[PDB]
Every structure is written in C-alpha cells, then in structure tokens.
Design an enzyme around this catalytic site. Structure first.
Site, PDB file in Angstrom:
ATOM      1  N   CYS A 240      -4.228   2.709 -13.146  1.00  0.00           N
ATOM      2  CA  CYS A 240      -4.910   2.791 -11.843  1.00  0.00           C
ATOM      3  C   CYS A 240      -4.403   4.036 -11.100  1.00  0.00           C
ATOM      4  CB  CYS A 240      -4.774   1.508 -11.031  1.00  0.00           C
ATOM      5  SG  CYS A 240      -5.831   0.178 -11.657  1.00  0.00           S
TER       6      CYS A 240
ATOM      7  N   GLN B 124       7.383   8.212  -9.537  1.00  0.00           N
ATOM      8  CA  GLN B 124       7.146   9.243  -8.517  1.00  0.00           C
ATOM      9  C   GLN B 124       8.280   9.324  -7.480  1.00  0.00           C
ATOM     10  OE1 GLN B 124       4.132  11.628  -7.718  1.00  0.00           O
ATOM     11  NE2 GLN B 124       4.910  11.617  -9.813  1.00  0.00           N
TER      12      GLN B 124
ATOM     13  N   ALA C 142      -3.538   7.501 -10.060  1.00  0.00           N
ATOM     14  CA  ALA C 142      -3.386   8.679 -10.864  1.00  0.00           C
ATOM     15  C   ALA C 142      -2.727   8.314 -12.204  1.00  0.00           C
ATOM     16  CB  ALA C 142      -2.600   9.712 -10.079  1.00  0.00           C
ATOM     17  N   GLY C 143      -2.163   7.097 -12.308  1.00  0.00           N
ATOM     18  CA  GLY C 143      -1.533   6.615 -13.523  1.00  0.00           C
ATOM     19  C   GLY C 143      -0.156   7.237 -13.821  1.00  0.00           C
ATOM     20  N   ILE C 144       0.615   7.548 -12.793  1.00  0.00           N
ATOM     21  CA  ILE C 144       1.979   8.097 -13.004  1.00  0.00           C
ATOM     22  C   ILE C 144       3.043   7.347 -12.201  1.00  0.00           C
ATOM     23  CG2 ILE C 144       1.090  10.309 -13.766  1.00  0.00           C
ATOM     24  CD1 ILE C 144       1.649  11.480 -10.998  1.00  0.00           C
TER      25      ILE C 144
ATOM     26  N   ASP D 197       0.845  -1.223   0.000  1.00  0.00           N
ATOM     27  CA  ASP D 197       0.000   0.000   0.000  1.00  0.00           C
ATOM     28  C   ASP D 197       0.869   1.258   0.000  1.00  0.00           C
ATOM     29  OD1 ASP D 197      -2.205  -1.688   0.203  1.00  0.00           O
ATOM     30  OD2 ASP D 197      -2.602  -1.246   2.306  1.00  0.00           O
TER      31      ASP D 197
END
Ligand SMILES: Cn1cc2c(Cl)c(-c3c[nH]c4nc(N5[C@@H]6CC[C@H]5C[C@@H](N)C6)cnc34)ccc2n1
Length: 494
Positions: free
Chosen positions: A426, A473, A428-430, A392
């Site tokens: 899924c 990220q 924010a897709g970044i 998570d």
C-alpha cells in the site's frame, strides 16, 4: 553522505554555508524539536534558503519538490537534474560534515580495556573502532584486532592526535576529520615495524544482541541511543544507490505512484506473458525481498492502470497471502486503491478473474478470502489480510495488534504447500511495508530458534534496504520494530 549534519542548528547551518560554502553549496539536517522533519539548507546569490522535508512514515516529502525513498536518492536526483521556491534552487556543492558520531566505528565513550574486551569477544581480524583518549583530553584512539580467525590474535592501539581540528597518527598527512583519516588507512593500511598490517576491514559490531536480552538493550537505547543508532543506519544508505532504470522508462512512468520512488532493477518483479500488443508489459513497481525460506514482495498500492498488473504478479509468483498496510483512504487521500471485488462478487481484471468468497472482520484487520484464476483455464485461494488500525501519522502505541496479525499471516502461509512470496503493500510500499516485513523476518528467526538466538536489527534493515529503496522510513518505525521484537519475546517467554 557527508552533506548530512546530524547535530547542527539552523544558525550553525547558515553560518557554515556563508563562511565555508559558495553559491550552490548545500547540506541537510534534522530538526531536534520535530522527530521526522528535515531541512535542506542551500546557498544561492549570497543568502541561505531552508527547505522543509517532512516524513510521517511513508516517504520524504520535499516542499516544492518531489517525494523520495531516501535523502541520498533525493540529493542524487537534484544533483543530476528543477528544484524551485518559483525560482530555481541549484544543489551543486555538498558542504561536508566532520562529525564522527554517525559512523559505525565511532564509540567516543569506550575506555581502553573495555575496547579490548569487546574486540576480544565480538571482533575478528580487521575489526576496528575509534574511541576518545582518556589520558589525552581531545585526542582519539584507533583500536584494531588482527589475527587467526592461542595468542594467534592481538589488539593494537593507535594514538590519534587532534591538532587545530586536524587528526593524525603522529606523522604524515593531517586530515580534516576522523572520517577522512579512517578512510585513508582503510584503503592504505598501517604497517608495524615488524610487518603486521593493521587492516581496517569491518567496524566492531555492537548491535547484534541475543534475543533474550532485548529488554536490556531497549532500556539502554531508551536513555536517546535509539536516535543515534538510527542515524548511523541512515548514513549507510549512500551504499544503496542501485540502478532503477526500468522504472524510469517513459513506458513505465505512469505505473509508479510517485515518479521517483522506483524498484531496483536487480530485485524488481519481472512480469512475463504480457499482452503481445503493448510495448512494455513486464513492469510493476514491486521488488522481491529475500531475507539474507519465507520470501516477500514489497510493492506500492495499485493505481487504476496497474490493478491488472498486480493480479498478473500474484498469479505468476504463486502468492497466496497479501498484506495491506493502509486503509483505502487516509486523511481524505487515496492510499491503496480497491483492487478486489465486493464480498460474494466476481470480477475480471484483464486475463485474471477474482471471486471474493468471504470477508471476516477482526479487531485490527479484515480478512478477505479471494479465489484467483486465469480466464479460460488454475484457481487458487489468496488470503488478503487488510490491516485497518495503523494510525494516520506515526506508529501504533502498542505492537500487540501488529504481532497478533503477523502471527496469523505466518500460520496461513505455512499451511499452504509451496505458496509463493507473501505480498506486502500500500501507499509507496517502503515505510509501513518495510516495517511489517522487518518485524516479520526478526520474529521468524525467534519462532524457529527461541529466545536464545542472535538478532541484529540495523543489519537486517540494511539487507532489506539493499532490495528495495528506503525500506523502513522513520526513527519511530525503527523504535517500533525493537518494541515489537521486545513484546514478542515477552509473550513467548511464558
Ligand atoms: C551491513 N551492515 C550495516 C550495518 C549498520 Cl549501518 C549497523 C548500525 C546501524 N546503526 C549502528 N549504530 C552503531 N552504534 C551506535 C553507538 C555505537 C555504534 C556506532 C555509532 N556511534 C552509533 C553500530 N552499528 C550500527 C549495524 C550493522 C550493520 N551491518
């Protein structure tokens, strides 16, 4: 991006803002003790406020503000706008960092002959670096290759004096940092007495490795260099502030999971053949990722009101494989809304029809065999690989499960003649999305060439980040990409 200070303490930050800033001055900085925590420090009314920015892998979450794909996009938003404690905090004047250690061209430690060898082996015309002087403790050296592509090339060394925290090449202007000095001579090259123009065209490349020697590099980066390489990548995100105007349209606002995480206009997936009785029907928060053979679409988790658009996209682009990077729900929060029917059932999603033919559970993922068709007509199978075991927060502690998954996704894709781009999504897709796509690009090279090909991890990420905001990220994801590549190479090795 001079407002980011990589090696500043909270107290250093306050002192700089109070002594060198004014009201509206601001800077951003890392936490040393907390791996993806950042602090926005701002002067207002003669005092300094600190605002936490957290990133667990999916987005930058500014406390009392919005979610953003990059710190550069965050700063641009508030400098062009609204940020509140509930009083307004204005970001007016970036407080600029002088620290050179996040510049591509900075190699403090390099000796003179070692810098010559590197430029001789890896460098071409206009390749340069800056190193610390060994002969003059506190000065710097600019080392530049120039020539044909022998003795048709040469390396020149330019001494950089440091006097009272200003840098100069022996005459003329004194600069407040090495960055200002380099930017000045990048734009206005030094000319030797006999004509040679010492052009600063590209930093020396020290990140391209041969894949065989991944284990060497990981060991070195693990002593870290990992953090230093990552921050140097992050410094370049100011080059990627491309326009995202279609996603900012009022008509499209509620098609976005997060109002400010938007697709670049130049790579967004444009939907054709939309409901003619509805104003803007061409928009989905999704971008084409074209490695610079196999392409990708990187997209967000659906909203209730975008599920129909998502299936229009899959059908239009001829995608036959979908990768989902999160559970539907994590930490009690919706991360990827269910857009597929229950097993054996059939649903219509606007003009599209989807049957769920069969679900197959594996350890780390579930595969759903979907049949997609347009109502009244076109059927194709779409294989949906739903990765279920990503933690998570942070990244998996072992890359084997992700690699085994991507290997299977790859073979499915290769088995289908003329399949369109692989959809990866899924949240924010970044973050995870960008992590999966980058691993996939890198391992693809290696699968086609072998252990003796060249890879450049940070180059590859910057290329994907030019096609969708903030792809990859966190430093933890960045490290995980190198681990996955390392692991892939070992399993292939024998
Ligand atoms: C188009 N493009 C963008 C690129 C970037 Cl951003 C890099 C890159 C990221 N991180 C780095 N770290 C590097 N290193 C460490 C150690 C010494 C050197 C300098 C700095 N002090 C950090 C070098 N290049 C990088 C590499 C290739 C790129 N191509």
């Amino acid at each position: 991006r001079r407002w980011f200070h990589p090696n500043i303490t909270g107290v250093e930050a306050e002192n700089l803002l109070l002594t060198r800033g004014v009201d509206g001055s601001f800077l951003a900085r890392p936490s040393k003790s907390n791996p993806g925590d950042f602090t926005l420090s701002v002067r207002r009314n003669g005092a300094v406020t600190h605002i936490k920015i957290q990133n667990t892998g999916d987005y930058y979450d500014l406390y009392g503000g919005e979610k953003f794909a990059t710190l550069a996009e965050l700063v641009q938003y508030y400098m062009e706008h609204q940020l509140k404690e509930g009083d307004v905090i204005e970001l007016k004047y970036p407080l600029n960092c002088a620290d050179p250690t996040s510049e591509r061209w900075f190699h403090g430690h390099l000796s003179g002959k070692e810098a010559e060898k590197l430029l001789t082996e890896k460098g071409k015309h206009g390749s340069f670096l800056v190193r610390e002087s060994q002969s003059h403790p506190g000065d710097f050296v600019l080392s530049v290759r120039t020539g044909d592509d022998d003795g048709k090339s040469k390396v020149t060394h330019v001494m950089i004096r440091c006097q009272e925290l200003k840098y100069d090449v022996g005459g003329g202007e004194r600069f407040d940092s090495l960055t200002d000095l380099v930017e000045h001579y990048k734009k206005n090259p030094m000319v030797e007495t006999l004509g040679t123009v010492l052009q600063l065209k590209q930093p020396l490349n020290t990140t391209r490795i041969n894949a065989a020697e991944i284990e060497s590099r990981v060991r070195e980066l693990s002593k870290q260099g990992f953090w230093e390489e990552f921050e140097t990548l992050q410094q370049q995100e100011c080059k990627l502030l491309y326009s995202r105007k279609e996603g900012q349209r009022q008509e499209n606002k509620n098609k976005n999971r997060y109002k400010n995480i938007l697709p670049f206009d130049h790579t967004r997936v444009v939907l054709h053949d939309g409901d003619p009785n509805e104003p803007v029907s061409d928009y989905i928060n999704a971008n084409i990722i074209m490695p610079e053979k196999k392409s990708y679409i990187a997209t967000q988790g659906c909203l209730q009101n975008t599920v129909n658009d998502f299936w229009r996209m899959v059908f239009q682009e001829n995608s036959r494989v979908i990768v989902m990077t999160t559970k539907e729900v994590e930490r009690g929060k919706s991360k990827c809304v269910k857009y597929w029917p229950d097993e054996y059932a059939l649903k219509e999603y606007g003009v599209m029809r989807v049957r769920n033919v069969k679900e197959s559970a594996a350890h780390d993922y579930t595969l759903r065999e979907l049949k997609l068709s347009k109502v009244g007509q076109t059927e194709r199978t779409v294989w949906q690989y739903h990765f279920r075991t990503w933690p998570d927060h942070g990244v998996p502690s072992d890359p084997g499960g992700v690699l085994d998954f991507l290997e299977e996704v790859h073979h499915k894709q290769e088995s289908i003649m003329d399949a369109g781009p692989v959809v990866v999504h899924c949240s924010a897709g970044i973050g995870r999305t960008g992590t999966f796509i980058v691993i996939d690009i890198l391992i693809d090279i290696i699968r086609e060439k072998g252990v003796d090909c060249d890879i450049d991890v940070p180059k590859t990420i910057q290329m994907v980040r030019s096609q969708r905001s903030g792809m990859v990220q966190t430093e933890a994801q960045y490290r995980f990409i190198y681990m996955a590549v390392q692991h892939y190479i070992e399993t292939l090795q024998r």
